[PDB]
């Protein structure tokens, strides 16, 4: 019932990845809410369940497939299905808990992890920070296999957490930020894997801050500056929405705009 987007690592190109991320963006928002030239995701409050999720069906060189479910309100992975099993992160609240019950309802084996899926938990469980986990087509290929094998005990928890970290950044974060999409496109283009640098990590850390600053801004002007990082790790401040237009592709909903 929910919309499905397909991607395969097998033969992946800059083109196929580009079309993949653009399709994900197109399914996340209707483009009806744009602020300072940046789209805002649907507001969770009052959102019909039929509009709440999209599915990303991933395949790899081994022709194994897993389907991630993404919450359109944050573009984030809430769980996945692999064959006849589905797994969900522990929901933060009753509403989200009720919402995920609508996912993967024909799957015979259904499991909700005791732990949630924010980066702090995933990094902890993986035994690695994002800075030390390689991204690219190769890592994505491997994560898909790891995810696929969890249900039969072929994958240990920390490997599963690392796999989630890879999927989330190459799909969720890429959709959220043209900049990070660009980082993955580069890796794909030159057939390389590499950990994300401080610019990517700090962007990820700042998605909420940027969303808030832009949406609460006084006619584009930030109430307070937001510090970001260059590729080399050095720090710089952003004071307004304009410089962020080429960087951010989607914002989490914070508040309503004026007419």
């Amino acid at each position, epitope marked *: 019932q929910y919309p499905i987007i397909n991607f395969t690592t097998a033969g992946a190109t800059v083109q196929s990845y580009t079309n993949f991320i653009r399709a994900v963006r197109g399914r996340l928002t209707t483009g009806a809410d744009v602020r300072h030239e940046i789209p805002v995701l649907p507001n969770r409050v009052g959102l019909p369940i039929n509009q709440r999720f999209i599915l990303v069906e991933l395949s790899n060189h081994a022709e194994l497939s897993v389907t991630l479910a993404l919450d359109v*309100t*944050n573009a*984030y992975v809430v769980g996945y299905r692999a064959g006849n099993s589905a797994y969900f992160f522990h929901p*933060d609240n009753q509403e*989200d808990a009720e919402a995920i019950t609508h996912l993967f309802t024909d799957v015979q084996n259904r499991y909700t992890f005791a732990f949630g*899926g*924010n*980066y*702090d*938990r995933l990094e902890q469980l993986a035994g690695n*920070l994002r800075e030390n986990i390689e991204l690219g087509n190769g890592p994505l290929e491997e994560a898909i296999s790891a995810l696929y094998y969890y249900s039969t005990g072929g994958t240990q928890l920390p490997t599963l957490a690392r796999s989630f970290i890879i999927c989330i950044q190459m799909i*969720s974060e890429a959709a959220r930020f043209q900049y990070i999409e660009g980082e993955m496109r580069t890796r794909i283009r030159y057939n390389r894997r590499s950990a994300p640098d401080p610019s990517v990590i700090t962007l990820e*850390n*700042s*998605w*909420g*801050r940027l*969303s*808030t600053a832009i949406q609460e801004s006084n006619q584009g002007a930030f109430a*307070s*500056p937001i*510090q970001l990082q260059r590729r080399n790790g050095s720090k710089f401040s952003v*004071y307004d929405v304009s410089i962020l237009i080429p960087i951010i592709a989607l914002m*989490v909903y914070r508040c309503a705009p004026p007419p």
Partner: nanobody
């Protein structure tokens, strides 16, 4: 809704010192980062120091060696030791806590504590 409470602000002479403490309404380990920021006269709010759940620290330019941010897991606080103070350090200081919620790293802020350095 996390609550943060700051103490330690006041009036000191140059070369003076302060210990700012931030108490939280939940375990500080719940937070991915905690920080101290300051808003000086005429200036925008800026970073003084941040510390992560794993002891990684970062400091605003020129504040390393002068200020120290530290966690106290027993007291459940994040603290800012401020040494050899100068008029330039006059500002409202804010405690910050950053918590992942629904995949978004959310900010919480104390009401602020004034530090004034006067000769």
């Amino acid at each position: 809704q996390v609550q943060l409470a700051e103490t330690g602000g006041g009036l000191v002479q140059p070369g003076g010192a302060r210990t700012l403490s931030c108490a939280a309404s939940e375990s500080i380990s719940s937070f991915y980062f905690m920080g101290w920021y300051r808003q000086a006269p005429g200036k925008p709010r800026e970073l003084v120091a941040e510390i992560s759940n794993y002891g990684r620290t970062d400091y605003g330019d020129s504040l390393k060696g002068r200020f120290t941010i530290s966690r106290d897991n027993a007291a459940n606080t994040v603290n800012l030791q401020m040494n050899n103070l100068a008029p330039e350090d006059t500002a409202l200081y804010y405690c910050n806590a950053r918590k992942w919620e629904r995949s978004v790293l959310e900010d919480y802020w104390g009401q602020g504590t004034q530090v004034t350095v006067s000769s």
